[PDB]
């Protein structure tokens with residue numbers, strides 16, 4: 322076939338569902354870089370994608386992504402019992418009490434950043450989110466963060482995912498940021514192991530520093546560093562969803578009123594933000610053995626891409642996926658395959674994001690503050706979603722003016 326890399330890069334979120342619409346199917350054979358790729362979309366496709374007897378991640382991860390977005394040696398590259406034992410380390414972090422502690426730290430950091438925002442008079446809301454998230458998640462994770470370094474660390478953490486998917490010299494910064502952040506986290510792990518850093522027994526950094534693998538060995542300091550960044554970086558990336566929260570409040574009538582007066586609405590709202598808005602485009606795996614599925618060949622070694630955005634906008638699952646309607650979540654059956662903004666399947670037995678509880682609790686804090694606490698004006702701007710950007714954002718970055726707080 323022809324190489325469709327540039328077409329994908331031009332339309333990362335929609336490329337797959339669009340061709341699926343053109344072809345009248347939930348899957349199509351394509352080619353990105355050198356490799357023939359099966360592209361899949363929808364609930365049934367996701368379910369076979371998460372079948373670990375048919376798919377592996379080891380031979381999947383494009384090694385320019387490990388130099389920016391993910392690091393080398395982390396949980397995303399693992400399969401089988403090695404993966405499950407590493408994944409359990411992340412899952413133990415996510416108790417309701419610890420998730421709530423992080424949400425509270427973030428609300429306090431949001432409230433502390435507001436006087437700064439007022440004094441600026443006008444802010445790019447997205448730009449302003451990285452630092453309070455960095456301060457909160459570092460504190461929560463037992464990562465010391467001096468006051469005068471937070472701004473810089475936040476910038477480096479942001480560069481890992483926002484300068485990563487960037488067809489620009491911004492890629493060089495992303496790579497330097499990765500080496501800097503990995504070296505920084507490694508010094509954190511080393512200090513914890515030597516006893517010069519007193520991170521608490523319940524914190525991410527402690528758990529990761531002291532984790533023993535299936536051979537009863539500590540992770541090498543660099544692998545532990547990568548796994549710690551796998552907590553810090555994606556927590557900072559919640560800036561994107563918080564920006565989408567403000568965007569929904571501004572562009573969809575009735576949403577604000579419902580949030581203020583209906584206590585159960587907020588949970589429905591944050592879920593619909595995750596379903597509706599583009600964030601993580603697609604996940605990649607490799608077929609581990611020859612099989613056939615719905616007339617399509619999956620030879621051993623075939624790269625397979627599961628389209629998350631398309632699956633989240635699948636009309637067989639949702640009725641009117643194109644509409645933004647939190648109420649749709651009253652009727653959701655909690656299926657692990659038909660709603661997949663951060664992966665599908667089981668958290669313990671597959672690669673599904675262990676960050677979902679944190680994302681939900683932090684988006685709830687955001688929605689609460691933006692309706693019950695924050696006061697702000699929204700000038701004329703281009704709020705349209707930039708579907709060509711990774712991550713996608715309102716083109717303006719959501720601009721606020723005259724910002725102040727209450728309690």
Ligand code: HEM
Nearest residue numbers: 396397551552555556558559600601663664672673674676
């Ligand atoms: C900010 C919004 C987030 C989005 C859009 C997102 C999305 C995703 C997606 C699509 C995957 C891959 C699932 C797969 O490979 O099948 C993933 C995995 C992962 N996420 Fe997130 N996530 C977010 C937040 C978080 C947070 C807050 C954490 C903090 C702990 C986190 C930690 C991880 C880790 C460690 C993995 C790898 C898990 C594995 O391979 O088993 N993520 N996420």
